[PDB]
């Protein structure tokens, strides 16, 4: 029970209801850490390094400084925190921009409407909602500008239905139009508790005289949109998170890609090899310390506690090898994906001009999947078509008239009945003079085009009249019937006015009664009275419903109309038949009495009103038919062919029937003239089973040839699909669909559009891409792996819930071929290399336990190793993962088969991860043996017989390691821009300049006392600048020669495409 006042802002506030502020932020300045730390430590690498840093705080165990890992941990943590804060601020910007809108609210003291913000809106205040504006909150209607009190709401955001719902006000309280009379009304509203049910409402409103009940018939939700109403007086009841729609808010589940799982497997492999190395080192340490207890007497070992000395030794290696799992990668990968999403959502070739809407990648975690898509579950109305109707053709009296007559059949052969294409000029030349017999029929048709509809006219200052219809087909019919002379103008209640431009005078007909449209009958009737005293009933309908109730002896153009419907349905044009009948006064009064008897029974409206209207629809005189087209977007017949040529299977979910869908698919270049159609249109489930069995056995009984497997398509209707989705028959459908190259689902139910997707991903390993528009298929977009939303006339409900928002369809040819094959080849190399540069360094920490008696001595400094992952090897990854292009976009679209290289997974796998790992091992061993062969006794200097030591050798090891890492990076890259020169030689010079300054300044502050005098013995030594030249070449000659060999004598596809790009 929720008691709400009517005009008391302070009386209802004592209950303490929610505020109208809608917050979508993830974090806040109050409880940021208690959740951010949990989110950051819920992963693997972060918790592992936290445990490592916690272990590193015990005495005499850390082989390096106590703060050499927690520093990098805090650095990556604050980087993640600042990125989360940036994205949360970017969300809160739009949140506050939407939450501070204006609202006209009644004032108790001012006794008038004042402008305020949505934040200060309280429950119980009277507001005045204008037109073409969203609903502020859950308000009950008090009054409106209409005399009865009705209004039109659209559920384009709360539901998927595009029709307008008529919400009527209470007749006992809709008399308060002025504001000054709003002060003498008192009472309370007892509403229900906040729930999530949409069309269920109950309450009780107390008026000045008597109480009234409540119902969802006078309740408007927040997600609706008011239309065709000047102003309404509303009383808020639910606000904030207490509404019916925003209470059970949906949460988009995090989509995990395949690259993520491969990264997880590689991390598990690295953890296993880490444990192996640690255990080997510990066993060697204990056996050497036990077998040589006499030759190591100068170390003063424990002895009686040697067992414990085992455990304290274990940790000693853990930390020493904890750098094998790089923590910088888990942030570098997401930063690279963010930069890639930014660079993709800012391309001109993916920008729409006629609407000013660029590509908006709403989820930057799914950028690499665009290079490995196999299924595309597309829509037709909106995604393939322009979703704008246009009156194309009309056929009356057995003739045909079109504006653009094609030269294919313009010359009427007159093979008996007249068949062909004519212009509207001949229609006018046969209509102007009344000597023709069909002229009254043409007049009746042209009046039916501008009278039988239910479109609302609006006049403007420019003179161009606008038409507002609940459906675009009726608006297109009105526009096609008005442009020749019979325009539809101001429509007053209970009559229709038509302006005749041929004569110059305006006529008016008395609209007696109209019947609403039905989904089963697919008809609509409307009775009119003319100034001539004749009563004429018009009726519009489908081609297979009204034609059954005709008079074959009266009309002589039945077969002509059937042919005009058949040849129009063969091109995908929506056809509508129009008929008329003259009635007398007695049957008119009888039909009025039947309509009154049907209106008195408010319990039955779907069947009672239809049977009342059909009581007189026993015979009709057919006037003719109209055909409206819906063209396809520009570039779709090319993008679909290019995607099919790249090896992608398309499932078009069409709302038409079999032949219409087949024709629009053949026009869309989806199918062909020789593509074997496996038609499956059956109502009996057993017959569908038999058809599937016949298909699968006729397919498996013989081998699949190259020309036979590439030329197969499937077509299935709605009921057959609903029967083929059961758990007992889904396998047959899946195995018969995995063979055909194009699937066409006809008469698809809205919700079923999701079941076709959630059935594939649960029984396959391919990646799915669902592109669509409007709300009716939003559940599809949230079901596949990559969701794409088109910005169209069905509302922005799909673009706000899709992972990518694209203006039209044509852009896919560049979104997947170029912005996918790159987005998969970059990040992969940006990850494998991220495992190499690490292994090429800290593996020298393992080859050294054979020289320090298995003690765990750091070969390099404690802070230089920590700076290796932060300053000197952080830019080549970004350059190869954001700015590298292995093949030009000019040749990546000419040869779409390159997409298959990313579609299978030929660039990122464990078999290549192990190759990178063993290459790192090889280079580490090379540098280690090369450095120990030169610093044999440390006697490798020429400065007055002074000898080198531990750190003067670790510095050379580190320098050679970073030089070889940068050489590998330079060998990997394909695009030599300027960021590459900033990343590789830039980092080389950065290290070469940063080492002397650091080692000369910081030792004097008790930070790195192991660098005293090492600068002289390193730089001034004549062997440093010789090993730095002789070791990297010796280690990279293998990679150089192998690259040359694989390019020259064992090439691939792109290895030849790059040669063609270079030389041509």
């Amino acid at each position: 029970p929720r008691v709400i006042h009517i005009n008391d802002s302070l009386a209802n506030s004592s209950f303490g209801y929610s505020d109208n502020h809608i917050s979508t932020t993830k974090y806040n300045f109050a409880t940021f850490l208690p959740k951010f730390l949990f989110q950051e430590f819920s992963k693997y690498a972060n918790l592992f390094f936290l445990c490592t840093s916690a272990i590193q705080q015990v005495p005499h165990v850390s082989p390096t400084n106590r703060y050499t890992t927690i520093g990098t941990l805090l650095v990556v943590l604050i980087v993640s925190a600042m990125k989360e804060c940036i994205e949360d601020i970017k969300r809160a910007n739009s949140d506050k921009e939407l939450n501070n809108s204006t609202a006209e609210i009644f004032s108790e003291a001012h006794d008038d409407f004042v402008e305020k913000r949505w934040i200060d809106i309280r429950v119980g205040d009277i507001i005045r909602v204008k037109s073409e504006e969203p609903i502020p909150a859950d308000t009950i209607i008090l009054s409106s500008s209409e005399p009865e009190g009705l209004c039109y709401i659209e559920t384009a955001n709360l539901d998927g239905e595009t029709n307008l719902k008529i919400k009527q006000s209470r007749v006992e309280t809709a008399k308060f139009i002025d504001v000054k009379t709003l002060k003498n009304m008192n009472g309370k509203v007892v509403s229900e508790q906040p729930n999530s049910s949409l069309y269920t409402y109950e309450g009780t409103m107390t008026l000045n005289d008597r109480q009234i009940p409540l119902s969802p018939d006078q309740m408007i939700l927040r997600g609706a949109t008011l239309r065709n109403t000047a102003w309404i007086f509303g009383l808020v009841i639910f606000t904030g998170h207490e509404t019916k729609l925003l209470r059970n808010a949906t949460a988009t589940p995090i989509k995990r890609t395949a690259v993520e799982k491969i990264i997880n497997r590689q991390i598990i492999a690295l953890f296993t090899v880490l444990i192996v190395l640690i255990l080997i080192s510990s066993i060697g340490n204990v056996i050497m310390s036990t077998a040589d207890a006499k030759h190591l007497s100068y170390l003063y070992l424990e002895g009686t506690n040697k067992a414990g000395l085992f455990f304290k030794d274990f940790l000693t290696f853990w930390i020493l090898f904890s750098n094998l799992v790089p923590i910088s990668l888990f942030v570098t990968v997401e930063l690279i994906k963010y930069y890639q999403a930014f660079m993709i959502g800012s391309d001109l070739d993916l920008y729409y001009e006629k609407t000013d809407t660029p590509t908006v990648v709403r989820t930057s975690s799914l950028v690499e999947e665009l290079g490995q898509i196999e299924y595309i579950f597309s829509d037709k109305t909106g995604t393939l078509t322009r979703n704008i109707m246009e009156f194309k053709s009309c056929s009356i009296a057995g003739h045909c008239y079109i504006d653009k007559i094609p030269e294919d059949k313009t010359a009427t052969v007159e093979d008996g009945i007249e068949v062909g294409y004519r212009k509207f000029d001949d229609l006018k030349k046969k209509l102007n003079d009344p000597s023709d017999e069909d002229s009254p029929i043409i007049n009746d048709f042209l009046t039916l085009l501008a009278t039988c509809h239910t479109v609302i006219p609006e006049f403007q200052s420019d003179g161009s009249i606008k038409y507002q219809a609940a459906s675009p087909d009726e608006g297109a019919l009105v526009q096609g019937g008005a442009d020749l002379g019979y325009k539809f103008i101001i429509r007053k209640p209970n009559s229709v006015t038509v302006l005749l431009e041929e004569t110059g005078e305006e006529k008016e007909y008395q609209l007696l009664n109209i019947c609403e449209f039905n989904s089963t009958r697919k008809r609509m009737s409307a009775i009119f009275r003319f100034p001539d005293g004749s009563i004429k009933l018009f009726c519009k309908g489908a081609d297979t419903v009204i034609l059954e109730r005709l008079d074959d002896e009266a009309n002589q153009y039945v077969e002509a109309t059937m042919r005009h419907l058949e040849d129009y349905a063969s091109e995908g044009l929506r056809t509508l038949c129009l008929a008329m009948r003259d009635i007398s006064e007695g049957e008119y009064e009888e039909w009025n009495s039947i309509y009154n008897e049907a209106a008195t029974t408010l319990d039955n409206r779907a069947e009672k009103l239809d049977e009342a209207a059909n009581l007189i629809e026993k015979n009709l005189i057919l006037i003719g038919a109209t055909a409206i087209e819906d063209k396809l977007q520009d570039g779709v017949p090319e993008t679909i062919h290019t995607l099919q040529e790249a090896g992608i299977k398309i499932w078009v979910l069409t709302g038409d029937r079999q032949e219409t869908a087949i024709n629009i698919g053949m026009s869309c270049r989806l199918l062909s003239e020789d593509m074997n159609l496996l038609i499956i249109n059956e109502e009996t489930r057993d017959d569908t089973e038999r058809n599937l069995l016949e298909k699968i056995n006729a397919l498996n009984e013989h081998q699949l040839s190259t020309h036979d497997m590439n030329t197969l398509a499937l077509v299935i209707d709605g009921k057959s699909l609903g029967f083929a989705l059961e758990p007992e028959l889904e396998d047959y459908l899946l195995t018969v669909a995995k063979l055909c190259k194009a699937v066409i689902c006809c008469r698809v139910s809205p919700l079923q559009k999701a079941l076709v997707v959630k059935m594939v991903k649960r029984k396959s390993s391919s990646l799915l891409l669902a592109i669509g528009d409007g709300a009716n298929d939003v559940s599809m977009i949230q079901a596949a792996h990559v969701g794409v939303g088109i910005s169209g006339m069905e509302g922005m409900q799909a673009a706000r819930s899709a992972d990518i928002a694209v203006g039209q369809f044509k852009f896919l040819k560049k979104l997947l071929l170029v912005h996918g094959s790159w987005s998969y080849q970059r990040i992969s190399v940006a990850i494998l290399y991220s495992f190499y540069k690490n292994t090429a360094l800290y593996m020298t920490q393992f080859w050294y336990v054979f020289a320090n008696a298995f003690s765990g001595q750091s070969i390099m400094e404690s802070w230089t190793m920590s700076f290796y992952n932060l300053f000197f090897t952080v830019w080549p990854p970004f350059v190869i993962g954001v700015f590298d292009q292995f093949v030009s976009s000019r040749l990546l679209e000419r040869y779409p088969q390159l997409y298959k290289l990313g579609q299978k997974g030929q660039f990122f796998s464990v078999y290549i991860f192990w190759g990178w790992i063993i290459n790192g091992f090889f280079h580490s061993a090379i540098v280690f043996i090369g450095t120990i062969l030169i610093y044999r006794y440390g006697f490798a200097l020429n400065m007055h017989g002074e000898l080198a030591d531990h750190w003067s050798w670790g510095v050379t090891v580190y320098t050679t390691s970073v030089i070889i890492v940068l050489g590998k990076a330079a060998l990997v890259t394909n695009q030599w821009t300027k960021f590459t020169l900033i990343a590789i030689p830039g980092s080389l010079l950065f290290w070469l300049i940063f080492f002397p300054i650091y080692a000369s300044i910081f030792p004097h502050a008790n930070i790195s006392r192991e660098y005293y005098g090492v600068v002289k013995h390193t730089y001034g030594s004549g062997v440093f600048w010789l090993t730095l030249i002789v070791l990297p070449i010796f280690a990279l000659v293998r990679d150089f020669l192998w690259k040359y060999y694989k390019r020259m004598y064992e090439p691939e596809t792109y290895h030849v495409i790059q040669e063609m790009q270079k030389y041509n």
Binding site: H60, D292, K294, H295, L296, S297, Y298, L299, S346, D347, L348, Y351, E353, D356, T357, P358, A851, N852, A853, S855, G856, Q857, F883, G930, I934, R936, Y937, G938, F939, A940, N942, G945, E946, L947, A948, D949, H950, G954, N974, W976, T977, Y1012, G1013, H1017, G1022, V1023, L1026, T1027, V1030, I1033, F1034, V1037, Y1044, M1048, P1051, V1056, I1057, Q1058, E1059, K1062
Partner: protein, 350 residues
Amino acid sequence: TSKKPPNTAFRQQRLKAWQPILSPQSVLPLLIFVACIFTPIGIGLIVSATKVQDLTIDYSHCDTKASTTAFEDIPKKYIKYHFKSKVENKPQWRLTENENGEQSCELQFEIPNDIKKSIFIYYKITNFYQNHRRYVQSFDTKQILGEPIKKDDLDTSCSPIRSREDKIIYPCGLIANSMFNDTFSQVLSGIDDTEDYNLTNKHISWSIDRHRFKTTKYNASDIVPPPNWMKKYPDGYTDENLPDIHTWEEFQVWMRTAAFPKFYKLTLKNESASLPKGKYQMNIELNYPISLFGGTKSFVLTTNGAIGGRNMSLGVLYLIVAGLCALFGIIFLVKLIFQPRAMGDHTYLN
């Protein structure tokens, strides 16, 4: 208002770049150039490492296998030498003892070639893990600067040798306690009409070590010697027994932890004159037993070169790289000459 992205070379990914191609005409000249520039460097480095003249004598076990009454020969297993000429007389050795068991090993060798370069003399230790983690970090750096650190403020890294009998051990650490203490002759005593050859003992450590190793400000009644120095400093420290780590340069040379268990340590040098040919003799006061670490002490007399001293690792590395380059530059050449690729066309591999 406008949401159209800019049209620039960066935002449209149209930056000018370079495509590295690996054509044979661009690879084979690179390989032959690398070979032609690495062969002279390699031969020059091996020639520079060849001209080093050195000598090494394993004087370990001299207290067991060396005579006492006369100079007997040293087994060929122990001696090593590289000179520009042939040595006529094999190095010999003898043992001697004074009072309180002060043993000494007297080695006698022959330098047959006038060494114009500056002479250096090291002691080589084997199987001594100075790079041990417990051993490399066990020394207080504040006492090296010379400060009176109290007991409760000493570095806990030198734990096993810290505060003996409730007195602050002044040289805390395992590196100082395990110091090599075999005194050398500091002069090559010439024999048979051969003049002596004095050797300098200072300026052998690092400059930063001489700058940081400061004379201690400790007293003598609050510090005790390390347990291994009690033989040379009995009854504790006094006003005169208290050393100075600033002038004690051998201490600074030993405190430089090496990287491998086979390391040199500079002891003596002479850069002011040439070492003429003749018979020389060196005395070593045997005090450091090899049973402490199971290694082999050695007396090394070397010179210096551009690389270091008798080490051909760099030269053989340069020669190996040049050889690999010159081998592949012929393999790939004959492979492309005798059988070309004949696969430049695309042939629709898709």
